[PDB]
Amino acid sequence: VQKIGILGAMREEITPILELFGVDFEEIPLGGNVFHKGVYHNKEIIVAYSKIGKVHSTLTTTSMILAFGVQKVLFSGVAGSLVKDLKINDLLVAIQLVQHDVDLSAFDHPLGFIPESAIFIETSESLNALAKEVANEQHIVLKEGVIASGDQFVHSKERKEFLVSEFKASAVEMEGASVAFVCQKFGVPCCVLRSISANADEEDAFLEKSAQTSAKFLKSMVDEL
Amino acid sequence: VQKIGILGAMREEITPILELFGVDFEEIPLGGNVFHKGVYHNKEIIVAYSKIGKVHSTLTTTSMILAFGVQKVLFSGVAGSLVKDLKINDLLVAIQLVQHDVDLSAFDHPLGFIPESAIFIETSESLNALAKEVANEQHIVLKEGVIASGDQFVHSKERKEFLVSEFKASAVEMEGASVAFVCQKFGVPCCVLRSISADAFLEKSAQTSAKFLKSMVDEL
């Protein structure tokens, strides 16, 4: 029985996901999270809001995997662009991610690095390839890049410039890296998709449209699994 | 069947705990961690190191609870002092913990606050009182205070003074708050104990902490 996890990074991103799949979803409370469980064409689909920041999103992902047995994870949301050519409404697949706020440079480690780990987190080759195929089929341009995540909102010119110089990041948000990290640790293929909600020089109804567009893209992925 | 989780931040702290409990531990890999499962006087003891930082420690704690059913968590480690009265080798129990690096101030949230949470995370009355009781019986001084945790190793005067001024923290490390938070979310009692550190120091400190943890478990 195939079991697929779907995360969104705002509560309001969940509604159009559950609506579009169209089946009944049972609400299961666990660890202060609510997981929505439904059956769609003989796959179990487990949908949750991550909650904010890395500790929340780690907890929700680890829970999803251990309590519900999800075998693959798709994580949708929005991100702010760090690069001129990545603009509002562009869709981005995260080929790698980084925890941009990790700093053990006092022990001469490169920024982003933790011992017994690595700076960059890898996502699923097969799921990213699937996202490319779906984007081709649906006539949606799909860009690729590195997403930086950290437990601060990044707004300053200096901090955005640091993300690009240090990590070659394309976009920034708060929960992607941690989710991808957990998945990788459990051998669970993960795909992290972001649509751009702010241009690189910048810091609601528009997020309602993005959340609908994302739900459509997620369903078109699941329809291929 | 009582199930107790014992967490250390780093590998060298585990070794002495496994040896002192003395029982046969089964090694169970899960989520890139190795959990050591043993039965000690009719209590199941699950021992693991987190690895460093908030993601790692949140992952490990959640696994302890969901995969192994632990009912109570004891977390031991070292921490750096932020106040003159906490000196090297002092033992501190964390009454509250904060994630000091969380900053949603761009949206007028206080520093350390995340929506659906709180700035300060609480720990177990009962387990804290047990730590105090063990310490009193053995004539070991046990200090109490707030622990600040974050994904940076804090070394500057400016950041240390920020921790004191913003959170009234007494000590700083990288994993306490995330472990305590996970336990709170699952209604699992948690005790966070830290020896003040500022390789050879660490060996002694791990042996003495293993003895203190064993002493607590003997009362549970």
From Swiss-Prot, chain A:
UniProt-listed InterPro entries: MTA_SAH_Nsdase (IPR010049), Nucleoside_phosphorylase_d (IPR000845), Nucleoside_phosphorylase_sf (IPR035994)
Known catalytic reactions: 6-amino-6-deoxyfutalosine + H2O = dehypoxanthine futalosine + adenine; S-adenosyl-L-homocysteine + H2O = S-(5-deoxy-D-ribos-5-yl)-L-homocysteine + adenine; S-methyl-5'-thioadenosine + H2O = 5-(methylsulfanyl)-D-ribose + adenine; 5'-deoxyadenosine + H2O = 5-deoxy-D-ribose + adenine
GO biological process assignments: L-methionine salvage from methylthioadenosine; L-methionine salvage from S-adenosylmethionine; menaquinone biosynthetic process; nucleoside catabolic process
GO MF entry, a single one: methylthioadenosine nucleosidase activity
E.C. number(s) listed in UniProt: 3.2.2.30, 3.2.2.9
Pathway: Quinol/quinone metabolism; menaquinone biosynthesis; Amino-acid biosynthesis; L-methionine biosynthesis via salvage pathway; S-methyl-5-thio-alpha-D-ribose 1-phosphate from S-methyl-5'-thioadenosine (hydrolase route): step 1/2
Active site: E13, A198
One Pfam family in the UniProt entry: PNP_UDP_1
GO terms for cellular component: cytosol
Keywords: Amino-acid biosynthesis, Hydrolase, Menaquinone biosynthesis, Methionine biosynthesis
Keyword Transmembrane helix on entry: no
First-tier enzyme category under EC: hydrolase
Task of the protein: Catalyzes the direct conversion of aminodeoxyfutalosine (AFL) into dehypoxanthine futalosine (DHFL) and adenine via the hydrolysis of the N-glycosidic bond; this reaction seems to represent an essential step in the menaquinone biosynthesis pathway in Helicobacter species. Can also probably catalyzes the hydrolysis of 5'-methylthioadenosine (MTA) and S-adenosylhomocysteine (SAH) to adenine and the corresponding thioribose, 5'-methylthioribose and S-ribosylhomocysteine, respectively.
Subunit structure comment from the entry: Homodimer.
Protein name (record): Aminodeoxyfutalosine nucleosidase
